[PDB]
Amino acid sequence: FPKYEASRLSSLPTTLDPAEYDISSETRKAQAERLAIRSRLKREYQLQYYDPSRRGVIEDPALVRWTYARSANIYPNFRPNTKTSLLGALFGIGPLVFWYYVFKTDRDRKEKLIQEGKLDRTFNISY
Amino acid sequence: MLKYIIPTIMLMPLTWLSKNNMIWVNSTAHSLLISFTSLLLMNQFGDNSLNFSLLFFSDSLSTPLLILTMWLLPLMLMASQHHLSKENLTRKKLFITMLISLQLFLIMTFTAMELILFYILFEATLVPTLIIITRWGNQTERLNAGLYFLFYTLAGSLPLLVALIYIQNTVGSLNFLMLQYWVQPVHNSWSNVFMWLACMMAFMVKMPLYGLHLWLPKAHVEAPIAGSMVLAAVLLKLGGYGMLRITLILNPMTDFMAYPFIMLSLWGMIMTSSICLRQTDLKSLIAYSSVSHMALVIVAILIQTPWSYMGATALMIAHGLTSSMLFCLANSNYERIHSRTMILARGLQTLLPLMATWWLLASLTNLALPPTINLIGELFVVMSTFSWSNITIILMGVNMVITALYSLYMLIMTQRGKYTYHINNISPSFTRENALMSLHILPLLLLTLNPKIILGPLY
Amino acid sequence: DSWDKDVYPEPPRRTPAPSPQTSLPNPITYLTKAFDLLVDRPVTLVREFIERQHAKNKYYYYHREFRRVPDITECQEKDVLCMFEAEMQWRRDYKVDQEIVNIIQERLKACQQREGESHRQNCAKELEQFTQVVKAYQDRYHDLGAHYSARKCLAKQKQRMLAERKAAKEA
Amino acid sequence: SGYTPEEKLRLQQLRELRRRWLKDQELSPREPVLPPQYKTYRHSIFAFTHVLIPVWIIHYYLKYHVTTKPYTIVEKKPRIFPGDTILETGEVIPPMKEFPDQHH
Amino acid sequence: NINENNPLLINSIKRLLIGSLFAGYIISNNIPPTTIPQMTMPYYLKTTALIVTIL
Amino acid sequence: APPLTLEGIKDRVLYVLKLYDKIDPEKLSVNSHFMKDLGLDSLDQVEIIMAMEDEFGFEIPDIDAEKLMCPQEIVDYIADKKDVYE
Amino acid sequence: AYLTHQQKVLRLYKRALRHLESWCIHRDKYRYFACLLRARFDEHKNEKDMVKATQLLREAEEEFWHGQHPQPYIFPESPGGTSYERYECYKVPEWCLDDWHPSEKAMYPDYFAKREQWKKLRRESWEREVKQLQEETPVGGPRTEALPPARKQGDLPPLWWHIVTRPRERPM
Amino acid sequence: MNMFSSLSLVTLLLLTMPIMMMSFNTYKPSNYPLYVKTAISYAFITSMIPTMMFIH
Amino acid sequence: GAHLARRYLGDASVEPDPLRMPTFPPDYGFPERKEREMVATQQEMNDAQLVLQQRDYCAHYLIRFLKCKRDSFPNFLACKHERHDWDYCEHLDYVKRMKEFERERRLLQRKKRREQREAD
Amino acid sequence: ITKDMLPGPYPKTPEERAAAAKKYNMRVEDYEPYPDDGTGYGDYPKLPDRSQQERDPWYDWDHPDLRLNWGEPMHWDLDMYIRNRVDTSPTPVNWNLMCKHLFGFVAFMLFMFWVGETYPAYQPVGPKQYPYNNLYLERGGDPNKEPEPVVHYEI
Amino acid sequence: SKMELPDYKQWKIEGTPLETVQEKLAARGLRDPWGRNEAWRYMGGFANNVSFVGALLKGFKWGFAAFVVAIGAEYYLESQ
Amino acid sequence: AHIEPRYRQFPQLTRSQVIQAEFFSATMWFWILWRFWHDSDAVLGHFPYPDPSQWTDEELGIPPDDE
Ligand SMILES: CCCCCCCCCCCCO[C@@H]1O[C@H](CO)[C@@H](O[C@H]2O[C@H](CO)[C@@H](O)[C@H](O)[C@H]2O)[C@H](O)[C@H]1O
Ligand SMILES: CCCCCCCCCCCCO[C@@H]1O[C@H](CO)[C@@H](O[C@H]2O[C@H](CO)[C@@H](O)[C@H](O)[C@H]2O)[C@H](O)[C@H]1O
Ligand SMILES: CCCCCCCCCCCCO[C@@H]1O[C@H](CO)[C@@H](O[C@H]2O[C@H](CO)[C@@H](O)[C@H](O)[C@H]2O)[C@H](O)[C@H]1O
Ligand SMILES: CCCCCCCCCCCCO[C@@H]1O[C@H](CO)[C@@H](O[C@H]2O[C@H](CO)[C@@H](O)[C@H](O)[C@H]2O)[C@H](O)[C@H]1O
Ligand SMILES: CCCCCCCCCCCCO[C@@H]1O[C@H](CO)[C@@H](O[C@H]2O[C@H](CO)[C@@H](O)[C@H](O)[C@H]2O)[C@H](O)[C@H]1O
Ligand SMILES: *C(=O)CCCCCCCCCCCCC
């Protein structure tokens, strides 16, 4: 049996993960308090979801944090360093300089051919 | 143009002298009548523009933009009157006044025959727009959005003012008809490189150009619905309209000055289309869609061919009706769930069937389904860019793939799937909301039958 | 009929006469007779009625004639009043030339369909006439840009004429 | 491993409510209470309204508008074979020349 | 619960069943020729499709 | 499909168990606990639930299945999932 | 992991039987190999050493992964099956009926009379349901997602509305 | 030409009529599926006439 | 066919190259070759609108078949004899091309013998 | 929500790591910020990179389509991991082996196509012959030039 | 309308491939306790199904007879 | 309805459905046999394939190896 080689896009099945087995009283304690947080959040939701007089949207702070974390909170936590500057230079200036030489070179060739009469434009009258 | 300026002004006394319960009925009814008479501007000739006086003229470029502007004012009123219902009566009248005053500056801006008169009106639109965003926006960030909107525009506009006055000193006139006959070529020099930049940077910021677009996601998101409708539909087109006019006096220098800005646009649209795939805010997604579409307009204006000018004109009109409709569609959801988060309310086609049809039609026009005028414009621009350089088909093609993905991603995420269980206040769509949607899409689809009236002067 | 046969030529029609070599009845023949009786006849009467109304109200419209004004060649530079008329004339002739190329393209497309599998040889005249007109149109108007004008057209012509002079100078 | 008594009791009580709810979904005999409001003839009015009226309009449209303009309807010209007689002129197309009439 | 006795089901399939038997024969015998069908070949090229199908 | 009934579901649940060779068909009732009364074990219980999935054509998740220990519970679980109220 | 050793073996048994059934297809062939597989599980039924039992379970999982069907059978309405969530587009929440126009409600006078009784029953029970949950929950919130039954006559089991009134599995 | 051209367009126009009726509230939605199916059957019949002329 | 096995796995110097054949004069070894006869005139194929690939030396049989097809409509089963006449003619044309391939191969075979014997 | 409940800066001290974990409804043991590399994550928790398709289908999620619970921290890339998009579930075949077999199949087929283009199949037949100087006039040849005669003979 | 299910005592593995399975299990000392739950699939109208060859030759008997009758008619139609 | 479901039993059939199926199955085999009789060439070959090795050198104009 060749062993399972996990990848980023092909995760490891739990039935083959050693952490799943050989459980300790310390792991069973972590699971108990994980289940507690889920149970406490469920009760808070249900008390509102089942309220007969509620009409509206049950505001979810976890959703609000997520949309805020992926917008307004990014710049305050930005630091110009070697990683960000190199990445910013690569993905910001990099592609623009690349496409410039691609199009400039292609268009310079075409203009040269048109001047000499070596570019076929027999029926080209729409542009 | 006095037959449109004067009645547009008369909307202000009409609103202020109306009964307290008829301000929306009266202003909406009479702004529609003004919209009707704007069709008289389509007396266009093959050779000559329609030149009314020493101050105002109309041509096939300004005419469709004028008709779009006067049509939008009625639609902005219907879109606004729900969320302003609790507003104080006098503050409601002031809000309508800002919209009317914005229309007045727009219809004069698109028809001013002299470029310095265009500049003053081009700039005068900042004031009502800024007031609308900051006074009647909902969030704390509306104050910052107004500052970005104001100073991004002015940072480019002030150099334009100096350039225009310099052009008048040296040429002797800024009248656009005169500039058609007295134009001289621009020869290479560092002095002319900066004249070119000062003539184009104000218009690029308004489009916006990729790199200078940061003001738009903020402003288009923080504004009230009416503010977003005019910002996307018309105000972005002041940049495109300005470029289309001033590039007359910039040749042949546009040959090489366009390269940095064509690169920013060709790559910018792919960058801003990709952004839309990972946007969590529905209004923000729509705003970034406008940047992607207006990148094509920038490229079409810069390469300066008969097909690209026709395509640019069609795109500006088509985008105006589509982007405005999408903001209105997203607003209807927001007026129900009071949140702009896209993933919050799902499966809405199950709860709001007819409004899901509008979502589909708006999405199809956005991804440029033929023969919509969105496709007509987008196709004409691609045809002319291919001739400019064949390799551009790769970037245009990729953008067309990405645009379909985010257009249908927004449709699928909000309208399909399972409804969110805890959201129980999705009331049925009002008549006002259904009519507001159909007043965007119906004119947009009708224009397919007669597309020549939105293809501009080079048709 | 309605259009000029000279502007839009059509070779003479040669339909072969029916030569049935079968005893069976031809379904198309009886379908044609049914079409004439049930479609063509009532449609024709409705039209003849409408034509009786149009004859009672006969009125005319005209084709605008444009007198010739001086070209941009005759205009003193920066003289807008004469430049304007020459420029408007040049734009009128530009649109007409576009429609001329459309007429020649429509002849070419009609021939290709009409000749069927023999088009490659039977449409050589239309191909040649299309090639010549497209060459002339390209010389006049190609590469002028979105901001084209009579002034730019003249500069393009002068550049072309200068090269032709030089090439002859080589001879 | 089975249900605990509390678990069983909660399921029992939900079940009574759920089944009562489902029973109440049944429609009464009078519901819905609506407000106030052979083949040949059926197939004849379809042919009339969907085939004849349209073909009337289309034939009128083609005959007096589309075909009055040049090159709107362009037909491939008929194939002419040796021995055919032209109806326009009566010209007789010559037969082909004699074959070697070889067969197999 | 097998049941294929609805006339809508039977008639719709029946028409396409008649098509899957004769339509190819009708079309081939009514379309004009536009090529030169290559009808001369060795036996093993003629029956190739038939044989590999049987295998 | 032909609608289910509580008596209809119960009959088929008992029908399947009567065809299981480890259950006496005469000692079997809707209230028979599989372990305490019928004397089966847990590996057997998995097969019984597997057989009811095949019978009625839908899967019962393992977390739900392990709690069904008498034929009446299976009848109640199925009627609940299929909205059977009689 | 929150599953006991028993629950893991029993789950592995069912999963391996289903994948075995997918390979075998034919019912008689499946019955033959299902009994051989049962014999293997019965062979270590009484293993007492938990350490040796766990190692047996580990190997069985490794063997199952090697021999699983790449395309196992899934019940059509099970997750991953061809009919999963097929009818979610037809499930409309009951609260949508409150927005119906009166002319729409007048079409079903008997249905909406009963509906009012259910809504009345929901209001009048809500307070007791909240109170019961408050008085049976230890300080610091519940430790599990389980819920109690009703303890009295006329009390309804707390948090029942969205269980009882959920959409039918085949609504349209 | 008149029959060939006329019939080859009714086929396309015939198929849009159910779409126009649906979009313009002028239909009896009793058996709309049967209406659409009937229109397709009639389009097939009218499409055969142009095809027979081509075959001939 | 075997010819491919000879050219690819064997010796391609004595195998016809389908692209460049024939590589010998037409009259080499053939004192006075008759020139192929064409029955149908260019105008007749033009007026029959035959597909260019169909305007070969058998076109006169195709014209008869197409004329029969039209005149026998709707009986789409007539004209069988005319179709066979055209099919047989095309078969004889194909056989000729097979002979031209064999002649080319046999000459390339000879050209090697006449070079090997001369070489030694 | 109030400012104390929104995401903040990278947590520097164990007291701030305990406040962040409480804010995100996590156990301090399970709470792990993204690395403080200046990329803008702040204290938003780093959650396992797994698709929502990987979660238990049979559990009673508050958002069954998303398979999320109300109040649980959402993955930074939640919108990329919805069930309509990136899937990370285990595969029956190892990822690296999967790539080898797919690439190997494609490369081999492309190689074999190049070989088949080098050694084309054809019949033992000479070129097809056409009359009238190889249909010179029909193919569009100029009628004002006499073409290089092409003669075909019998055999 | 109660659906009367068939009596369960009629399902027996005897005379079906399930009985073969039991014999191959009996050799190793095992039993199949669910065999009787599968027996309905090998009994009644589900017992005895066509082979693949037989499936293709559905209708070949009458089709051939019609073919024989048709060529006789065609043949004599040419001769007479 | 016209057909009732059965439990663990072969379903009820109508006479019409069985007869129509047989008729079209039979019609398939009549067609194949009918066409095969009249058109066996389309399956086996329409024309003989000449054996090129059977052609004489004078047929092909291959001159003697001397001259
Ligand atoms: C987004 C920003 C985009 C930035 C785009 C940058 C464009 C750069 C354009 C460079 C070309 C400027 O135009 C160039 O100016 C110099 C002025 O010194 C002119 O040249 C003049 O000065 C130079 C000295 O440097 C001498 O070599 C020359 O003898 C003299 O005539 C050139 O004749 C002209 O070609
Ligand atoms: C923000 C994205 C940045 C991406 C990088 C973009 C780089 C863009 C560089 C701007 C263009 C500079 O290069 C520019 O090329 C054109 C030719 O095409 C030159 O144009 C000039 O020189 C050419 C010959 O060189 C002459 O025909 C003529 O005098 C004139 O056209 C300009 O003198 C030069 O300034
Ligand atoms: C530019 C358009 C030119 C053509 C215009 C012709 C308009 C004539 C429209 C006639 C009615 C069309 O709209 C619709 O037609 C069909 C067929 O009659 C009717 O439908 C009726 O017949 C069909 C099938 O026969 C049944 O499925 C249906 O139950 C029944 O109501 C509808 O009741 C009618 O509303
Ligand atoms: C009728 C079909 C007609 C078309 C036929 C096309 C055949 C295409 C065959 C492509 C084979 C490519 O796949 C090839 O397989 C072997 C076996 O796993 C892989 O090799 C792999 O397997 C084993 C380990 O498990 C080891 O040999 C090796 O360490 C490993 O790399 C190769 O890395 C891969 O390149
Ligand atoms: C254009 C060519 C047309 C060719 C048409 C040829 C005639 C059509 C024949 C239709 C056959 C109808 O008759 C049908 O035949 C089959 C096969 O024998 C019979 O089936 C027969 O065998 C099966 C099992 O072997 C028995 O269950 C059945 O009782 C017995 O009669 C059907 O019970 C009978 O209904
Ligand atoms: C030679 O004639 C070139 C043909 C190329 C390959 C065709 C494949 C035919 C296989 C014949 C084997 C016989 C099995 C029916």
Side-chain angles (χ1 to χ4, degrees), chain J residues 97 100-101 104-105 108:
Chain J
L97 191 53
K100 288 166 170 168
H101 286 173
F105 168 80
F108 173 77

mmCIF file of all heavy atoms in Angstrom, chain J residues 97 100-101 104-105 108, ligand 4:
data_model
loop_
_atom_site.group_PDB
_atom_site.id
_atom_site.type_symbol
_atom_site.label_atom_id
_atom_site.label_comp_id
_atom_site.label_asym_id
_atom_site.label_seq_id
_atom_site.Cartn_x
_atom_site.Cartn_y
_atom_site.Cartn_z
ATOM 1 N N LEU J 97 1.023 11.446 -8.493
ATOM 2 C CA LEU J 97 0.799 10.380 -9.459
ATOM 3 C C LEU J 97 -0.242 10.790 -10.488
ATOM 4 O O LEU J 97 -0.117 10.472 -11.674
ATOM 5 C CB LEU J 97 0.367 9.108 -8.738
ATOM 6 C CG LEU J 97 0.352 7.837 -9.580
ATOM 7 C CD1 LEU J 97 1.681 7.624 -10.275
ATOM 8 C CD2 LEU J 97 0.012 6.652 -8.707
ATOM 9 N N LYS J 100 1.479 12.892 -13.042
ATOM 10 C CA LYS J 100 2.374 12.120 -13.897
ATOM 11 C C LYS J 100 1.603 11.394 -14.988
ATOM 12 O O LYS J 100 2.013 11.393 -16.151
ATOM 13 C CB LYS J 100 3.163 11.114 -13.066
ATOM 14 C CG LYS J 100 4.236 11.712 -12.195
ATOM 15 C CD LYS J 100 4.713 10.691 -11.183
ATOM 16 C CE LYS J 100 5.953 11.155 -10.443
ATOM 17 N NZ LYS J 100 6.239 10.280 -9.274
ATOM 18 N N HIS J 101 0.486 10.766 -14.632
ATOM 19 C CA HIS J 101 -0.246 9.980 -15.615
ATOM 20 C C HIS J 101 -0.929 10.868 -16.642
ATOM 21 O O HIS J 101 -0.976 10.525 -17.827
ATOM 22 C CB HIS J 101 -1.256 9.079 -14.913
ATOM 23 C CG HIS J 101 -0.630 7.913 -14.219
ATOM 24 N ND1 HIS J 101 -1.340 7.060 -13.404
ATOM 25 C CD2 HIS J 101 0.644 7.460 -14.218
ATOM 26 C CE1 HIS J 101 -0.530 6.133 -12.931
ATOM 27 N NE2 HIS J 101 0.679 6.352 -13.410
ATOM 28 N N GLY J 104 1.989 12.410 -18.735
ATOM 29 C CA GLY J 104 2.590 11.352 -19.527
ATOM 30 C C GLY J 104 1.717 10.932 -20.693
ATOM 31 O O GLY J 104 2.210 10.702 -21.798
ATOM 32 N N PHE J 105 0.412 10.820 -20.463
ATOM 33 C CA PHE J 105 -0.497 10.461 -21.545
ATOM 34 C C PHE J 105 -0.483 11.518 -22.640
ATOM 35 O O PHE J 105 -0.412 11.198 -23.830
ATOM 36 C CB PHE J 105 -1.910 10.279 -20.997
ATOM 37 C CG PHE J 105 -2.963 10.198 -22.058
ATOM 38 C CD1 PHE J 105 -3.176 9.023 -22.747
ATOM 39 C CD2 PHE J 105 -3.740 11.297 -22.366
ATOM 40 C CE1 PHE J 105 -4.141 8.945 -23.721
ATOM 41 C CE2 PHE J 105 -4.708 11.220 -23.341
ATOM 42 C CZ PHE J 105 -4.906 10.041 -24.019
ATOM 43 N N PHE J 108 2.918 11.690 -24.582
ATOM 44 C CA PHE J 108 3.074 10.547 -25.472
ATOM 45 C C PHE J 108 2.203 10.684 -26.710
ATOM 46 O O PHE J 108 2.648 10.394 -27.826
ATOM 47 C CB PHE J 108 2.736 9.261 -24.727
ATOM 48 C CG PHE J 108 2.700 8.050 -25.604
ATOM 49 C CD1 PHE J 108 3.871 7.458 -26.032
ATOM 50 C CD2 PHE J 108 1.498 7.504 -26.000
ATOM 51 C CE1 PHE J 108 3.842 6.350 -26.835
ATOM 52 C CE2 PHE J 108 1.464 6.391 -26.802
ATOM 53 C CZ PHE J 108 2.637 5.814 -27.222
HETATM 54 C C1 LIG M 4 -5.648 2.142 -26.367
HETATM 55 C C2 LIG M 4 -4.928 3.372 -25.741
HETATM 56 C C3 LIG M 4 -4.081 4.097 -26.814
HETATM 57 C C4 LIG M 4 -3.274 5.265 -26.176
HETATM 58 C C5 LIG M 4 -2.245 4.722 -25.138
HETATM 59 C C6 LIG M 4 -1.490 5.877 -24.496
HETATM 60 C C7 LIG M 4 -0.528 5.322 -23.416
HETATM 61 C C8 LIG M 4 0.021 6.484 -22.540
HETATM 62 C C9 LIG M 4 0.932 5.908 -21.431
HETATM 63 C C10 LIG M 4 1.456 7.087 -20.518
HETATM 64 C C11 LIG M 4 2.041 6.522 -19.226
HETATM 65 C C12 LIG M 4 2.590 7.703 -18.345
HETATM 66 O O1 LIG M 4 2.539 7.327 -16.940
HETATM 67 C C13 LIG M 4 3.695 6.791 -16.408
HETATM 68 O O2 LIG M 4 3.297 5.622 -15.558
HETATM 69 C C14 LIG M 4 4.312 5.220 -14.553
HETATM 70 C C15 LIG M 4 3.713 4.192 -13.642
HETATM 71 O O3 LIG M 4 3.039 4.811 -12.599
HETATM 72 C C16 LIG M 4 4.803 6.406 -13.745
HETATM 73 O O4 LIG M 4 5.825 5.959 -12.775
HETATM 74 C C17 LIG M 4 5.415 6.044 -11.459
HETATM 75 O O5 LIG M 4 4.901 4.708 -11.001
HETATM 76 C C18 LIG M 4 5.824 3.893 -10.155
HETATM 77 C C19 LIG M 4 5.556 4.158 -8.725
HETATM 78 O O6 LIG M 4 4.181 4.017 -8.473
HETATM 79 C C20 LIG M 4 7.314 4.126 -10.440
HETATM 80 O O7 LIG M 4 7.641 3.466 -11.666
HETATM 81 C C21 LIG M 4 7.724 5.569 -10.545
HETATM 82 O O8 LIG M 4 8.494 5.898 -9.375
HETATM 83 C C22 LIG M 4 6.583 6.545 -10.635
HETATM 84 O O9 LIG M 4 7.050 7.744 -11.253
HETATM 85 C C23 LIG M 4 5.405 7.408 -14.664
HETATM 86 O O10 LIG M 4 5.913 8.534 -13.891
HETATM 87 C C24 LIG M 4 4.400 7.904 -15.652
HETATM 88 O O11 LIG M 4 5.076 8.755 -16.610
#
